[PDB]
Amino acid sequence: AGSLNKVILIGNLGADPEIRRLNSGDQVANLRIATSESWRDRNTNERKERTEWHNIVIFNENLVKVVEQYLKKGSKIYIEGQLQTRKWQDQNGNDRYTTEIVLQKYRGELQMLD
Amino acid sequence: AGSLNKVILIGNLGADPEIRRLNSGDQVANLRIATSESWRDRKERTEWHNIVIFNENLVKVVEQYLKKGSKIYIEGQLQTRKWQDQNGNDRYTTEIVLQKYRGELQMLD
Numbered sequence: 001a002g003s004l005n006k007v008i009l010i011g012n013l014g015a016d017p018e019i020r021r022l023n024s025g026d027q028v029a030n031l032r033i034a035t036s037e038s039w040r041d042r043n044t045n046e047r048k049e050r051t052e053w054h055n056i057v058i059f060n061e062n063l064v065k066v067v068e069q070y071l072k073k074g075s076k077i078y079i080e081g082q083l084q085t086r087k088w089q090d091q092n093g094n095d096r097y098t099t100e101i102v103l104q105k106y107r108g109e110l111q112m113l114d
Numbered sequence: 115a116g117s118l119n120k121v122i123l124i125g126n127l128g129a130d131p132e133i134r135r136l137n138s139g140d141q142v143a144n145l146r147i148a149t150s151e152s153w154r155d156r157k158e159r160t161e162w163h164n165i166v167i168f169n170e171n172l173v174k175v176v177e178q179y180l181k182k183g184s185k186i187y188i189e190g191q192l193q194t195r196k197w198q199d200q201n202g203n204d205r206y207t208t209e210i211v212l213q214k215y216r217g218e219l220q221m222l223d
Contacts, residue, residue: 002185003125003149005161007192010118035119042214052119052193076116082151083121083192084161085208099194099208 005082007101009054010113011035013075017067029067031056033079056081058103063110070112080109119191121210123163124222125149127184131176140214143167143176147186165190167212172219179221189218 011033018030036051056079058064071077081101088096103110125147132144145165152158165188167173180186190210199205212219 001150001152004123004187005125005149005151005163006122008118008120008122010116012117035117036115037119038115052191054119054192078118082161083163096205097207
């Protein structure tokens, strides 16, 4: 292969995890995680700050059960996944893209940091 | 802080890099990088990543060395920006961003 696709986040859940059971019986967790930053603007010397929101999708059964058991709004976690951008079509036939951090079955890491 | 936003990729440029001078006078590089994964049930899936580099020392590396096909390692941060389409509707685009003075890039060929 000769490639690597790895996202590592440490952040806080913006809301309680969303756990759904797909028609197949498979569980999936969706999380929304906040990461943030501060810095001096180099030209204005103003102090700046920016929060980034990340959509996490977890298919790994072990980690779903961890999320299910332990995670709530405000929980701080470490997570490792892969970036996947899915392509879809809205009502108008227009192509749309959604980028997610995906923890596939047998992959990914989640550590509770609280 | 108590937070971290880090993406690490190794992959190949899917096109020659794009280098531009913004109105501030700063330079920016846009690259597009493929990573891939194989599996059976033999299938391949290529993931395309859109990289924006504001770090001017790393823009110079892109300019002086990188071309279509080049294999690189890059460390950056995920940023999702908002924009409006032709009909005024909100849309979103997620990019791996290397801000001024941040990020890493190593040529691997």
